[PDB]
């Protein structure tokens, strides 16, 4: 069958993906530009991610369409159109890893996040990561390429000129570069690092949820212990456990000032052997607990849960990157590691290529379904 028929389907699908990648990610960038509630360090990496995806639509997809034709080209110019998508994929990987680390810093050390993670430092990191992405993605242009060994029969068959090759991805980009350097070192290792970071994020959240519930349970149990206490020493033991626990949750302010002060009141009576007076003073903690501590409780729990939700949203983005890019990388592994295996058929290569490009469509939908500030800003933009 004429190659232009299957090529037409592949090209049409690529162009449809390009249109969607541009539109959705321009909308992401416009939302962040317009909404100050979306202007934080996390979303600067989101914007860097959306910029890479815009460039997939504007440049990498036109480059991929071009390189599927095998047109005659100078080999190094062919290398650049082959490899520019690797720059954009690498930049996405750095942004995804930055977002994960950012969310880890926010949940592990929230008291120093604002002083540690600033807009100026984030912009500097983004710039450095773009430079590194060009270095990593265009490494074949530094000499790790197949231009020294052109396929002359294919070039002659296409009527190519002297110094030109039929411009095809696997003819110019070495597969050991793609498998060992690009896939294993530059993609697989950072994704596994991201997985580790997300594991620590969710473990940290669960531990802090446990601690909040243990501190809450300790407060209510020791009050009950005091009520059924007999000597002053038992009242003293329970209040001491409450006081240390009260200060531990103290790391709203008036409520803990009342709580500690009321614990100290009962402790002073307990040390004087006045059990009934200490027990009666301790019953007032219940008034403080209802009016302050429980509210100062579900708010921290609510905040942690919002952080879990935001961490899950970021993790879905990273996971969709892995799902969309892994088939093409896995095919490369088969090409490289199994020379006795027939090459993956051309329709599957096209499917794996277009799947990798669909990843540049999906992030705006994840933000729309999972982040209210984005969803609400999207709606206002579309209406206006
Ligand atoms: C900022 C944006 C708009 C710049 C876009 C520039 C792009 C389209 C340019 C820059 C370098 C160019 C390549 C440089 C060299 C060659 C080799 C030649 O034998 C065929 C064309 C080819 C393969 C060019 C294709 C077009 C190209 C990729
Ligand atoms: C969802 C993601 C993470 C995994 C997807 C796995 C895909 C990419 C795997 C599963 C089965 C695989 C195929 C199994 C057998 C062959 C025949 C061989 O001659 C060429 C490779 C080829 C054609 C493989 C290509 C890659 C393949 C299609
Ligand atoms: C997703 C993370 C955890 C792992 C990535 C999966 C990669 C590294 C694995 C999954 C399946 C593997 C392939 C399974 C089968 C074969 C055929 C054999 O003749 C050569 C190796 C080769 C081609 C393997 C190479 C590595 C491979 C592609
Ligand atoms: C992630 C980087 N990357 C790749 O690894 C890749 C690729 N394209 C191919 C193979 C194409 C092909 C193979 C055999 C053919 O006969 C053919 O005919 C046109 C085409 N690979 C391996 N691109 C898309 C340009 C790509 O972005
Ligand atoms: C935007 C519009 C169409 C883009 C058309 C660009 C592709 C034209 C070259 C072409 O179709 O060649 C296919 C190849 O020869 C067969 O495998
Ligand atoms: C062919 C050309 C290829 C182009 C390669 C680089 C293109 C783009 C990255 C620029 C977009 C990244 C913007 C991130 C958002 C940001 O930087 O915001 C930080 C803020 O200023 C802190 O206060
Ligand atoms: C952990 C995820 C990445 C893993 C390394 C897996 C890479 C395994 C590569 C297989 C090596 C191989 O296939 O060698 C066959 C040889 O060519 C006989 O012809
Ligand atoms: C903002 C615009 C960005 C670039 C627009 C689209 C880019 C298209 C990329 C160029 C591939 C086509 C050039 C190769 C064909 C001519 C070479 C030949 O005929 O031998
Ligand atoms: C081919 C290059 C390979 C080595 C790349 C070295 C990294 C390039 C660094 C320059 C980036 C310029 C921006 C520096 C400002 C960062 C300050 C900050 O972190 O806030
Ligand atoms: C992360 C998920 C990874 C999924 C890996 C899927 C690959 C498993 C299937 C491997 C079977 C490949 C064997 C095909 C040999 C071809 C025989 C031949 O053509 O001579
Ligand atoms: C998710 C992916 C988006 C939708 C998938 C689109 C499916 C077709 C991609 C192009 C398939 C190429 C057709 C056959 C080419 C050939 O004859 O070798
Ligand atoms: C929908 C966009 C379709 C654009 C037409 C491209 C046809 C493919 C081709 O010309 O080879
Ligand atoms: C030559 C290619 C250069 C153009 C790349 C195209 C993609 C860039 C997209 C725009 C970056 C968004 C900048 C402002 C968005 C939010 C950032 C902010 O205001 O804090
Ligand atoms: C905002 C602009 C974004 C890009 C617009 C341009 C769209 C270009 C579409 C595909 C370019 C394919 C070029 C065809 C390669 C030449 C084929 C050949 O010479 O044999
Ligand atoms: C937005 C500013 C961008 C600045 C220009 C970036 C493009 C660089 C242009 C030339 C270097 C391209 C490398 C491939 C062309 C030479 C290879 C060859 O012909 O054999
Ligand atoms: C090797 C270098 C090739 C070109 C690299 C520079 C292009 C990306 C520059 C910085 C991206 C904008 C950062 C602004 C925040
Ligand atoms: C670091 C990343 C920047 C360097 C990337 C590619 C080098 C730029 C141009 C090289 C292509 C020209 C090769 C040639 O014409 O022989
Ligand atoms: C192919 C990969 C090559 C990598 C080479 C290593 C170079 C990268 C080095 C790290 C960049 C850090 C930039 C810090 C300097 C300016 C920041 C500052 O003002 O404090
Ligand atoms: C981390 C992911 C990469 C892990 C190890 C890479 C496997 C090394 C390749 C095995 C031997 C290759 C060969 O003998 O041809
Ligand atoms: C993971 C980081 C690098 C991949 C492992 C090293 C590559 C295996 C050795 C290469 C070879 O034997 O040809
Ligand atoms: C090869 C592994 C790819 C996974 C990268 C994405 C990391 C985040 C995944 C989900 C976290 C679940 C806990
Ligand atoms: C191989 C595993 C690759 C990524 C895991 C995908 C999980 C997140 C994507 C779907 C959202 C649930
Ligand atoms: C992670 C899901 C794995 C996908 C399994 C799909 C089927 C794999 C088995 C292929 C063996 C057939 C060999 C082709 C010749
Ligand atoms: C998911 C949507 C369909 C995915 C298409 C690939 C499905 C299974 C992989 C094996 C099929 C590839 C053709 C057989 C391999 C061969 O002919 O060498
Ligand atoms: C084919 C065009 C893209 C297919 C689906 C794009 C994924 C969008 C998120 C839902
Ligand atoms: Na991306």
UniProtKB/Swiss-Prot annotation:
Provide Extracellular-side residue ranges: 3-8, 68-78, 145-174, 338-345
Cell compartment(s), UniProt: Cell membrane
Pull the Cytoplasmic topological domain ranges from the record: 34-43, 102-121, 200-313
Which cysteines bridge via disulfide bonds?
A: 72-160, 75-147, 78-167, 338-341
Q: Which residues bind adenosine?
A: 170, 332, 356-357
Q: Name one GO cellular component term.
A: neuronal cell body
Biological process (GO) annotations?
adenylate cyclase-activating G protein-coupled receptor signaling pathway; adenylate cyclase-modulating G protein-coupled receptor signaling pathway; apoptotic process; apoptotic signaling pathway; astrocyte activation; blood circulation; blood coagulation; cell-cell signaling
Which keywords has UniProt assigned to this entry? Cell membrane, Disulfide bond, G-protein coupled receptor, Glycoprotein, Membrane, Receptor, Transducer, Transmembrane, Transmembrane helix, Ubl conjugation
Q: Name one GO molecular function term.
A: G protein-coupled adenosine receptor activity
What do we know about how this protein assembles, alone or with others? Answer: Interacts (via cytoplasmic C-terminal domain) with USP4; the interaction is direct. May interact with DRD4. Interacts with NECAB2. Interacts (via cytoplasmic C-terminal domain) with GAS2L2; interaction enhances receptor-mediated adenylyl cyclase activity.
Q: Which family does it belong to?
A: Belongs to the G-protein coupled receptor 1 family.
**Its biological purpose:** Receptor for adenosine. The activity of this receptor is mediated by G proteins which activate adenylyl cyclase.
Protein name, UniProt field: Adenosine receptor A2a
User: Which species is this UniProt entry from?
Assistant: Homo sapiens
């Amino acid at each position: 069958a004429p190659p232009i028929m299957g090529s037409s389907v592949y090209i049409t699908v690529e162009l449809a993906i390009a249109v969607l990648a541009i539109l959705g990610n321009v909308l992401v960038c416009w939302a962040v530009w317009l909404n100050s509630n979306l202007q934080n360090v996390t979303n600067y990496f989101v914007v860097s991610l959306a910029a890479a995806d815009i460039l997939v639509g504007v440049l990498a997809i036109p480059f991929a369409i071009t390189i599927s034709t095998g047109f005659c080209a100078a080999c190094h110019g062919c290398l650049f159109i082959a490899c520019f998508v690797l720059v954009l994929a690498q930049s996405s990987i750095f942004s995804l890893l930055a977002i994960a680390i950012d969310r880890y810093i926010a949940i592990a050390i929230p008291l120093r996040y604002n002083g540690l993670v600033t807009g100026t430092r984030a912009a500097g990191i983004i710039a450095i990561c773009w430079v590194l992405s060009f270095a990593i993605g265009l490494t074949p242009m530094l000499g790790w390429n197949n231009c020294g060994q052109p396929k002359e029969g294919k070039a002659h068959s296409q009527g190519c000129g002297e110094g030109q090759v039929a411009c095809l991805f696997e003819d110019v980009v070495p597969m050991n570069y793609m498998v060992y350097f690009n896939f294993f070192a530059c993609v697989l290792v950072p994704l596994l690092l991201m997985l580790g970071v997300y594991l620590r994020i969710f473990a940290a959240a669960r531990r802090q949820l446990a601690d909040l519930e243990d501190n809450w349970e300790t407060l209510n149990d020791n009050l009950k212990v005091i009520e059924k206490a007999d000597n002053a020493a038992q009242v003293k033991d329970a209040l001491t456990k409450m006081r240390a626990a009260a200060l531990d949750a103290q790391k709203f302010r008036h409520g803990f000032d009342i709580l500690v002060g009321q614990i100290d009141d009962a402790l002073k009576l307990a040390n004087e052997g006045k059990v009934k007076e200490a027990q009666a003073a301790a019953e007032q903690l219940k008034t403080t607990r209802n009016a302050y501590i429980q509210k100062y409780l579900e708010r921290a729990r609510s905040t942690l849960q919002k952080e879990v939700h935001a961490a899950k949203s970021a993790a879905i983005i990273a996971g969709l990157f892995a799902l969309c890019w892994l088939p093409l990388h896995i095919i490369n592994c088969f090409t490289f590691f199994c020379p006795d295996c027939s090459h993956a058929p051309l329709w599957l290569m096209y499917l794996a290529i277009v799947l990798s490009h669909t990843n540049s469509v999906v992030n705006p939908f994840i933000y729309a379904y999972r982040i209210r500030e984005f969803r609400q800003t999207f709606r206002k933009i579309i209406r206006s």
